[PDB]
Coordinates of C-alpha atoms and ligand atoms in Angstrom, one line a residue:
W1 CA 18.1 10.0 14.6
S2 CA 20.2 7.2 13.1
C3 CA 20.2 5.6 9.7
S4 CA 18.5 2.3 10.8
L5 CA 15.8 4.2 12.6
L6 CA 15.0 6.3 9.5
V7 CA 14.6 3.2 7.2
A8 CA 12.7 1.3 9.9
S9 CA 10.3 4.3 10.2
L10 CA 9.9 5.0 6.5
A11 CA 10.0 1.5 4.9
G12 CA 7.8 0.4 7.9
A13 CA 5.1 3.0 7.2
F14 CA 5.4 2.9 3.3
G15 CA 4.4 -0.8 3.1
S16 CA 1.9 -0.9 6.0
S17 CA 0.2 2.4 6.7
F18 CA 0.4 4.0 3.2
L19 CA -1.4 0.9 1.8
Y20 CA -4.3 1.6 4.2
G21 CA -4.5 5.2 3.1
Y22 CA -4.2 4.2 -0.6
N23 CA -6.8 1.5 -0.4
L24 CA -9.5 3.8 1.0
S25 CA -9.2 6.2 -1.9
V26 CA -8.0 4.1 -4.9
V27 CA -11.6 2.9 -5.2
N28 CA -13.0 6.4 -5.9
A29 CA -11.6 7.2 -9.4
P30 CA -12.5 3.9 -11.3
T31 CA -16.1 3.8 -9.9
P32 CA -17.8 4.4 -13.4
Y33 CA -15.5 1.8 -15.0
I34 CA -15.9 -0.9 -12.4
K35 CA -19.7 -0.6 -12.0
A36 CA -19.8 -1.1 -15.8
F37 CA -17.8 -4.4 -15.7
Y38 CA -20.2 -5.7 -13.1
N39 CA -23.1 -5.0 -15.5
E40 CA -21.5 -7.0 -18.3
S41 CA -20.1 -9.7 -16.0
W42 CA -23.7 -10.2 -14.6
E43 CA -25.1 -10.6 -18.1
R44 CA -22.5 -13.1 -19.5
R45 CA -23.1 -15.4 -16.5
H46 CA -26.7 -14.9 -15.1
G47 CA -28.4 -14.3 -18.5
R48 CA -30.2 -11.0 -17.8
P49 CA -29.3 -7.3 -17.3
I50 CA -28.4 -6.2 -13.7
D51 CA -31.1 -4.1 -12.0
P52 CA -29.9 -0.6 -10.6
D53 CA -30.4 -1.7 -6.9
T54 CA -28.3 -4.9 -7.2
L55 CA -25.7 -2.9 -9.0
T56 CA -25.6 -0.2 -6.3
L57 CA -25.4 -3.0 -3.7
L58 CA -22.5 -4.9 -5.4
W59 CA -20.6 -1.6 -5.5
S60 CA -21.5 -0.7 -1.8
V61 CA -20.2 -4.2 -0.9
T62 CA -17.0 -3.9 -3.0
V63 CA -16.2 -0.6 -1.3
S64 CA -16.9 -1.5 2.3
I65 CA -15.8 -5.2 2.5
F66 CA -12.3 -3.8 3.2
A67 CA -13.6 -3.0 6.7
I68 CA -14.6 -6.6 7.4
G69 CA -11.1 -7.5 6.2
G70 CA -9.7 -5.0 8.8
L71 CA -11.8 -6.5 11.5
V72 CA -10.6 -10.0 10.7
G73 CA -7.0 -8.8 10.3
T74 CA -7.1 -7.1 13.7
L75 CA -8.2 -10.2 15.5
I76 CA -5.5 -12.3 13.7
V77 CA -2.7 -10.1 15.3
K78 CA -3.8 -11.2 18.8
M79 CA -2.8 -14.8 17.9
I80 CA 0.1 -14.2 15.5
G81 CA 1.9 -11.7 17.8
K82 CA 2.8 -14.4 20.3
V83 CA 4.5 -16.6 17.6
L84 CA 6.4 -14.5 15.0
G85 CA 7.6 -11.2 16.5
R86 CA 7.4 -7.6 15.4
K87 CA 9.6 -7.5 12.3
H88 CA 8.7 -10.9 10.9
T89 CA 4.9 -10.0 11.1
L90 CA 5.4 -7.0 8.8
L91 CA 7.2 -9.3 6.3
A92 CA 4.7 -12.2 6.5
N93 CA 1.9 -9.6 6.2
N94 CA 3.0 -8.8 2.6
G95 CA 1.7 -12.3 1.7
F96 CA -1.6 -10.6 2.0
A97 CA -0.8 -7.3 0.3
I98 CA 0.7 -9.0 -2.8
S99 CA -1.8 -11.9 -2.9
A100 CA -4.7 -9.4 -2.8
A101 CA -3.2 -7.0 -5.4
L102 CA -2.7 -10.0 -7.9
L103 CA -6.4 -11.0 -7.4
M104 CA -7.8 -7.5 -8.0
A105 CA -5.6 -6.6 -11.0
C106 CA -6.4 -9.7 -12.9
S107 CA -10.2 -9.4 -12.3
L108 CA -10.7 -7.7 -15.8
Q109 CA -8.9 -10.5 -17.7
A110 CA -10.5 -13.3 -15.8
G111 CA -14.0 -11.9 -16.3
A112 CA -15.4 -12.8 -12.9
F113 CA -16.3 -10.0 -10.5
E114 CA -15.7 -12.2 -7.4
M115 CA -12.0 -11.7 -7.6
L116 CA -12.3 -8.0 -7.0
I117 CA -14.7 -8.3 -3.9
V118 CA -12.5 -11.2 -2.4
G119 CA -9.4 -9.1 -3.4
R120 CA -10.7 -6.1 -1.3
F121 CA -11.3 -8.5 1.7
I122 CA -7.8 -10.0 1.7
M123 CA -6.4 -6.4 1.2
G124 CA -8.5 -5.5 4.3
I125 CA -6.7 -8.2 6.3
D126 CA -3.4 -6.4 5.6
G127 CA -5.0 -3.1 6.7
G128 CA -6.2 -4.7 10.0
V129 CA -2.9 -6.6 10.7
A130 CA -0.4 -3.9 9.8
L131 CA -2.0 -0.9 11.5
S132 CA -2.0 -2.9 14.8
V133 CA 1.7 -3.9 14.5
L134 CA 3.4 -0.9 13.1
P135 CA 2.7 1.5 16.1
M136 CA 4.0 -1.1 18.5
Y137 CA 7.1 -1.9 16.4
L138 CA 8.0 1.9 16.0
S139 CA 7.4 2.7 19.8
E140 CA 9.5 -0.4 20.8
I141 CA 12.6 0.5 18.7
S142 CA 12.6 4.3 19.2
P143 CA 14.7 6.3 21.8
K144 CA 12.5 7.3 24.8
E145 CA 12.7 10.9 23.4
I146 CA 10.4 10.7 20.4
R147 CA 8.1 7.7 21.3
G148 CA 5.3 10.5 21.3
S149 CA 6.1 12.0 17.9
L150 CA 6.0 8.9 15.7
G151 CA 2.2 8.8 16.3
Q152 CA 2.2 11.6 13.7
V153 CA 4.5 9.5 11.4
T154 CA 2.0 6.6 11.2
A155 CA -0.7 9.1 10.4
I156 CA 1.0 11.3 7.8
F157 CA 1.7 8.1 5.8
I158 CA -2.1 7.4 5.8
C159 CA -2.7 10.9 4.3
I160 CA 0.1 10.5 1.7
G161 CA -1.7 7.3 0.9
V162 CA -5.2 8.8 0.4
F163 CA -3.5 11.6 -1.8
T164 CA -1.5 9.1 -3.9
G165 CA -4.7 7.1 -4.6
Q166 CA -6.3 10.4 -5.8
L167 CA -3.4 11.3 -7.9
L168 CA -3.0 8.1 -10.0
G169 CA -6.8 8.2 -10.6
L170 CA -6.5 11.4 -12.7
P171 CA -7.5 10.6 -16.4
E172 CA -3.9 11.8 -17.3
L173 CA -2.5 8.8 -15.4
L174 CA -4.0 5.3 -14.7
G175 CA -7.6 6.4 -14.2
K176 CA -8.5 5.9 -17.9
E177 CA -11.0 3.3 -19.1
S178 CA -8.3 0.9 -20.4
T179 CA -5.6 1.0 -17.6
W180 CA -7.9 0.9 -14.5
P181 CA -6.7 -2.6 -13.3
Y182 CA -3.2 -1.0 -12.8
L183 CA -4.6 1.2 -10.1
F184 CA -4.9 -2.0 -8.0
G185 CA -1.9 -3.8 -9.6
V186 CA 0.5 -1.0 -8.5
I187 CA 0.0 -2.0 -4.8
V188 CA 2.7 -4.6 -5.5
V189 CA 5.4 -1.8 -5.6
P190 CA 4.9 -0.5 -2.0
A191 CA 4.8 -4.1 -0.8
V192 CA 8.1 -5.2 -2.6
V193 CA 9.9 -1.9 -1.6
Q194 CA 9.1 -3.0 2.0
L195 CA 10.3 -6.6 1.6
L196 CA 13.6 -5.4 0.0
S197 CA 14.1 -3.1 3.0
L198 CA 13.0 -4.3 6.4
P199 CA 14.8 -7.8 6.6
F200 CA 18.3 -6.2 7.0
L201 CA 17.2 -4.1 10.1
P202 CA 17.2 -5.6 13.7
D203 CA 14.0 -7.0 15.2
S204 CA 12.5 -4.9 18.0
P205 CA 14.7 -4.8 21.1
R206 CA 11.9 -5.6 23.6
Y207 CA 10.7 -8.7 21.7
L208 CA 14.3 -9.9 21.7
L209 CA 14.6 -9.4 25.4
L210 CA 11.2 -10.2 26.9
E211 CA 9.8 -13.0 24.6
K212 CA 12.8 -14.5 22.6
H213 CA 15.1 -14.4 25.7
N214 CA 18.3 -13.1 24.0
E215 CA 20.3 -10.3 25.7
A216 CA 23.1 -10.2 23.1
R217 CA 20.7 -9.7 20.3
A218 CA 18.7 -7.1 22.4
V219 CA 21.9 -5.2 23.1
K220 CA 22.7 -5.2 19.3
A221 CA 19.2 -4.0 18.5
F222 CA 19.3 -1.1 21.0
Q223 CA 22.9 -0.1 20.0
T224 CA 21.9 -0.1 16.3
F225 CA 18.7 2.0 16.7
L226 CA 19.9 4.4 19.5
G227 CA 23.4 4.9 17.9
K228 CA 25.3 5.0 21.2
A229 CA 27.8 2.9 23.1
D230 CA 26.0 1.8 26.3
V231 CA 22.4 0.5 26.3
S232 CA 22.5 -1.5 29.6
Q233 CA 20.2 1.3 31.0
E234 CA 17.3 0.5 28.5
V235 CA 18.0 -3.3 28.9
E236 CA 17.6 -3.0 32.7
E237 CA 14.7 -0.6 32.3
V238 CA 12.8 -3.0 30.0
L239 CA 13.5 -5.9 32.3
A240 CA 12.5 -3.8 35.4
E241 CA 9.2 -2.9 33.7
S242 CA 8.7 -6.6 32.9
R243 CA 9.5 -7.6 36.6
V244 CA 6.5 -5.4 37.6
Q245 CA 4.2 -6.2 34.6
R246 CA 4.7 -10.1 34.8
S247 CA 2.8 -10.0 38.1
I248 CA -0.3 -8.4 36.6
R249 CA -3.6 -10.3 36.1
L250 CA -5.0 -9.3 32.6
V251 CA -8.7 -8.5 32.2
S252 CA -10.7 -10.3 29.5
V253 CA -12.8 -8.4 27.0
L254 CA -16.2 -9.8 28.3
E255 CA -15.2 -8.9 31.9
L256 CA -14.0 -5.3 31.1
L257 CA -17.3 -4.7 29.3
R258 CA -19.3 -5.3 32.5
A259 CA -17.3 -4.3 35.6
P260 CA -18.8 -1.1 37.2
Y261 CA -15.4 0.5 38.3
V262 CA -14.6 1.2 34.6
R263 CA -18.1 1.5 33.0
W264 CA -17.8 5.1 31.7
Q265 CA -14.2 4.6 30.5
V266 CA -15.7 1.8 28.2
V267 CA -18.8 3.9 27.1
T268 CA -16.6 7.0 26.4
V269 CA -14.3 4.9 24.2
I270 CA -17.2 3.2 22.3
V271 CA -18.9 6.6 21.8
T272 CA -15.6 8.4 20.7
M273 CA -14.7 5.6 18.3
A274 CA -18.2 5.3 16.8
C275 CA -18.4 9.1 16.0
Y276 CA -14.7 9.1 14.7
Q277 CA -16.1 6.9 11.8
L278 CA -19.8 7.8 11.6
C279 CA -18.8 11.5 11.2
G280 CA -18.6 10.3 7.6
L281 CA -15.1 11.3 6.6
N282 CA -14.6 7.8 5.0
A283 CA -17.7 8.4 2.9
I284 CA -15.9 11.6 1.6
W285 CA -12.9 9.4 0.7
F286 CA -14.5 6.4 -0.9
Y287 CA -17.2 8.3 -2.8
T288 CA -15.8 11.8 -3.5
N289 CA -16.7 11.9 -7.3
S290 CA -20.3 11.1 -6.5
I291 CA -20.5 13.9 -3.8
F292 CA -19.0 16.6 -6.0
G293 CA -21.0 15.3 -9.0
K294 CA -24.4 16.0 -7.3
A295 CA -23.1 19.4 -5.9
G296 CA -23.2 20.8 -9.5
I297 CA -19.5 21.0 -10.2
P298 CA -18.9 20.7 -14.0
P299 CA -18.5 17.0 -15.0
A300 CA -15.1 17.5 -16.8
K301 CA -13.5 19.1 -13.7
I302 CA -14.4 16.7 -10.9
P303 CA -11.1 14.6 -11.1
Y304 CA -9.0 17.7 -10.6
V305 CA -11.3 19.2 -7.9
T306 CA -11.2 15.9 -6.0
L307 CA -7.4 16.0 -5.8
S308 CA -7.5 19.1 -3.6
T309 CA -9.1 17.0 -0.8
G310 CA -6.0 14.7 -0.3
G311 CA -3.9 17.8 -0.4
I312 CA -5.7 19.6 2.4
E313 CA -5.8 16.4 4.3
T314 CA -2.0 16.0 4.1
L315 CA -1.3 19.7 5.0
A316 CA -3.7 19.3 7.9
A317 CA -2.0 16.1 9.2
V318 CA 1.5 17.7 8.8
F319 CA 0.4 20.6 11.1
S320 CA -1.6 18.3 13.5
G321 CA 1.3 18.0 15.9
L322 CA 1.4 21.7 17.0
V323 CA -2.2 21.7 18.2
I324 CA -2.7 18.2 19.8
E325 CA -0.1 18.9 22.6
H326 CA -0.8 22.6 23.0
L327 CA -4.7 22.5 23.4
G328 CA -5.0 19.2 25.3
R329 CA -7.7 16.6 24.6
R330 CA -11.1 18.2 25.7
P331 CA -11.3 21.2 23.4
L332 CA -10.1 19.2 20.4
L333 CA -12.6 16.4 20.7
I334 CA -15.4 19.0 21.4
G335 CA -13.8 21.2 18.7
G336 CA -13.6 18.8 15.8
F337 CA -16.9 17.1 16.3
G338 CA -18.4 20.6 16.9
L339 CA -17.1 22.3 13.7
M340 CA -17.9 19.2 11.6
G341 CA -21.5 20.1 12.8
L342 CA -21.3 23.6 11.4
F343 CA -19.8 22.5 8.1
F344 CA -22.2 19.6 7.4
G345 CA -24.9 22.2 8.1
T346 CA -23.5 24.8 5.7
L347 CA -22.7 22.0 3.1
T348 CA -26.4 21.0 3.2
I349 CA -27.3 24.6 2.4
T350 CA -24.9 25.0 -0.5
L351 CA -25.9 21.6 -2.0
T352 CA -29.7 22.6 -1.8
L353 CA -29.4 26.1 -3.2
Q354 CA -27.0 24.8 -5.9
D355 CA -29.0 26.6 -8.7
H356 CA -30.1 29.8 -7.0
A357 CA -26.8 31.3 -8.2
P358 CA -23.9 30.3 -10.5
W359 CA -21.2 30.5 -7.8
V360 CA -22.8 28.4 -5.0
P361 CA -21.4 25.0 -6.1
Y362 CA -17.8 26.2 -5.5
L363 CA -18.7 27.0 -1.9
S364 CA -19.5 23.2 -1.5
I365 CA -15.8 22.6 -2.2
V366 CA -14.8 25.0 0.6
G367 CA -17.4 23.4 2.8
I368 CA -15.9 19.9 2.3
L369 CA -12.3 21.2 2.6
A370 CA -13.3 22.6 6.0
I371 CA -14.8 19.3 7.1
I372 CA -11.4 17.6 6.2
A373 CA -9.3 20.3 7.9
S374 CA -11.5 20.2 11.0
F375 CA -10.9 16.5 11.4
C376 CA -7.0 16.3 11.1
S377 CA -6.4 19.5 13.0
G378 CA -8.5 17.7 15.7
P379 CA -9.8 14.2 16.3
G380 CA -7.7 12.6 13.4
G381 CA -5.1 11.0 15.8
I382 CA -6.6 11.3 19.2
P383 CA -9.0 8.4 19.9
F384 CA -6.3 5.7 19.8
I385 CA -4.2 7.9 22.2
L386 CA -7.2 8.3 24.6
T387 CA -7.9 4.6 24.5
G388 CA -4.5 4.2 26.2
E389 CA -4.7 7.0 28.8
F390 CA -7.9 5.9 30.5
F391 CA -6.7 2.3 31.4
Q392 CA -3.8 0.5 33.2
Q393 CA -1.7 -2.2 31.5
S394 CA -4.0 -4.7 33.3
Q395 CA -6.9 -3.6 31.2
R396 CA -5.5 -1.8 28.1
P397 CA -4.8 -5.0 26.0
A398 CA -8.5 -5.9 26.1
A399 CA -9.6 -2.2 25.7
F400 CA -7.9 -2.1 22.3
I401 CA -10.1 -5.0 21.1
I402 CA -13.3 -3.1 22.1
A403 CA -12.0 0.2 20.6
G404 CA -10.7 -1.7 17.5
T405 CA -13.9 -3.7 16.9
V406 CA -16.1 -0.5 17.1
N407 CA -13.8 1.3 14.7
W408 CA -14.0 -1.3 11.9
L409 CA -17.7 -2.1 12.3
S410 CA -18.3 1.7 12.0
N411 CA -16.1 2.0 8.9
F412 CA -18.1 -0.8 7.4
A413 CA -21.5 0.7 8.5
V414 CA -20.8 4.1 6.9
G415 CA -19.0 2.7 3.8
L416 CA -21.9 0.3 3.0
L417 CA -24.8 2.6 3.8
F418 CA -23.7 6.0 2.3
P419 CA -25.0 5.3 -1.4
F420 CA -28.4 4.4 0.1
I421 CA -28.6 7.4 2.4
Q422 CA -27.7 9.7 -0.5
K423 CA -30.3 8.1 -2.9
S424 CA -33.0 8.5 -0.2
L425 CA -32.5 12.1 0.9
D426 CA -30.5 13.7 -2.1
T427 CA -29.2 17.1 -0.9
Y428 CA -30.1 16.6 2.8
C429 CA -28.0 13.4 3.1
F430 CA -25.4 15.3 5.2
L431 CA -27.8 16.1 8.0
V432 CA -27.2 12.5 9.2
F433 CA -23.4 13.2 9.8
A434 CA -24.4 16.6 11.2
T435 CA -26.7 14.9 13.7
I436 CA -24.0 12.3 14.7
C437 CA -21.1 14.8 15.0
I438 CA -23.2 17.2 17.2
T439 CA -24.4 14.2 19.3
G440 CA -20.7 13.2 19.8
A441 CA -19.8 16.8 20.8
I442 CA -22.7 17.2 23.2
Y443 CA -21.9 13.9 24.8
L444 CA -18.1 14.5 25.3
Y445 CA -18.8 18.0 26.7
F446 CA -20.9 16.4 29.5
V447 CA -18.4 13.5 30.2
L448 CA -14.8 13.6 29.0
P449 CA -12.3 14.8 31.7
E450 CA -9.1 16.5 30.5
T451 CA -6.1 14.2 29.9
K452 CA -3.1 16.4 29.1
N453 CA -0.6 16.6 32.1
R454 CA -3.0 14.5 34.3
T455 CA -2.0 11.2 35.9
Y456 CA -3.9 7.9 35.7
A457 CA -4.7 8.4 39.4
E458 CA -6.4 11.8 38.7
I459 CA -8.3 10.6 35.5
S460 CA -9.8 7.5 37.2
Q461 CA -10.8 9.7 40.3
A462 CA -12.8 12.0 37.9
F463 CA -14.7 9.0 36.4
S464 CA -15.4 7.5 39.9
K465 CA -18.2 10.2 40.4
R466 CA -20.3 8.4 37.6
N467 CA -18.9 4.8 37.8
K468 CA -20.1 4.9 41.5
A469 CA -17.6 2.0 42.3
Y470 CA -13.9 1.4 43.0
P471 CA -11.4 -1.5 42.2
Ligands
LIG501 C1 -26.1 -2.3 -18.5 O1 -25.5 -2.2 -19.8 C2 -26.5 -2.1 -20.8 C3 -25.8 -2.1 -22.1 O2 -24.9 -3.2 -22.2 C4 -27.3 -0.8 -20.6 O3 -28.4 -0.7 -21.5 C5 -28.4 0.4 -22.4 O4 -28.8 1.5 -21.7 C6 -28.9 2.7 -22.5 C7 -29.2 3.9 -21.6 O5 -30.5 3.6 -21.0 C8 -29.9 2.5 -23.7 O6 -29.9 3.6 -24.5 C9 -29.6 1.2 -24.4 O7 -30.5 0.9 -25.4 C10 -29.4 0.1 -23.5 N1 -29.0 -1.2 -24.2 C11 -29.6 -2.3 -24.0 C12 -29.1 -3.5 -24.8 O8 -30.6 -2.5 -23.3 C13 -27.9 -0.8 -19.1 O9 -28.6 0.4 -18.9 C14 -26.8 -1.0 -18.1 N2 -27.4 -1.1 -16.8 C15 -27.1 -0.4 -15.7 C16 -28.0 -0.4 -14.6 O10 -25.9 0.2 -15.7
LIG502 O1 -5.4 11.1 9.4 C1 -6.3 10.3 9.1 N1 -7.0 10.3 7.9 C2 -7.9 9.4 7.5 O2 -8.5 9.6 6.5 C3 -8.1 8.4 8.5 N2 -9.0 7.3 8.4 C4 -8.8 6.6 9.6 O3 -9.3 5.5 9.9 N3 -7.8 7.2 10.3 C5 -7.4 8.3 9.7 N4 -6.5 9.2 10.0

């Protein structure tokens, strides 16, 4: 480690990954105060009281519109990444983080509810842009000794995000009736702590050697991050990789989706990425107070019981490293989506017998904590790794658009629908996530070949038996 690599890692993550993790839990705690402002703001403009379904819809849209922001933001990186660079994107990106926080936090004074829905969208653009650039920036600057470890550092800062959003929402802090706009207005601090930190650090070495054509700056960037005298070895390596890679014909998204010699590597990334969101963990983050409310937990205690979830999330993510490498890929993706099946099952029991005894509701807490801990000691970080290990650099840039598009449309499709599933089934609503998790686990059992300590040549050979075609 070196000083510049610490601040590049931390002030990178703290303004770019943490504000994804925060933005998918900050919306939980002020739920009963925001829905109330919609009610009034729909009377003083449209001249009649808001009906319960329209109110449930405006909230379902306010929560989930973030994911359409994430989709739009992901497809903006494809175009911007050729022009600005790695460092300057994570600066210019905080145009969105600040311009979205100043929309949302003024929504109560201005009286119009559009500013909060549009604010969530532009805040989604940040979450789509900065999750796509931060992994590439970190893995371009780092010594070739830890490029594997920092995949846990982008993830732990999501969890410390979802936890901080659950802490400030306690009624001791900003989650009161009067202060709720500052839950959104505080997003300016992580953004400005990044803008007053990253500019002084070097831009990524690679970008300064393969796209901006400056060896002297590339050497300075390598010397500053690696903290050693000679870097000609990495300079030559990166140019050597480029001398190979520059010959490659890239595959287009529409062409990758159809060719037979990769068909099960595309189906197995769409089916992993769908279940990674439709397993419903984001419905547990956005709507936790509703879930614990209907479980029969005492109304006065739900803010404090909720805070445990972001805790057990963060402890799970911190200990994620020492299972992902030790167990390989196959018994984790059949493990996680298998145990989330058992725990959505037993949750549905404890929600339904919630009044057959006085102690049962507190087993619905343990049920949901085991759903969280089965995800992070498990699938939490793996699908974006597997998307890389199935494909060559010829295909991989297009594969990340398929695997990125399925992700955001699934985050949207569970964040928007959950209030309507819950209203229609009551205590049995979690049998939907039980059915999708176990369908994911039965699928990956019959398809996914092991990936740890296996070459691209071996993996592709295993899929050839069902692709029934070759390059
Ligand atoms: C929207 O707000 C109004 C109040 O501004 C709510 O109406 C009150 O609801 C309570 C509980 O049912 C009644 O005791 C009051 O008499 C109602 N007041 C009026 C003026 O009707 C209304 O329920 C809210 N709507 C929703 C769906 O939240
Ligand atoms: O560790 C994670 N926790 C989440 O809550 C989450 N959500 C997401 O999209 N990726 C991750 N990763």
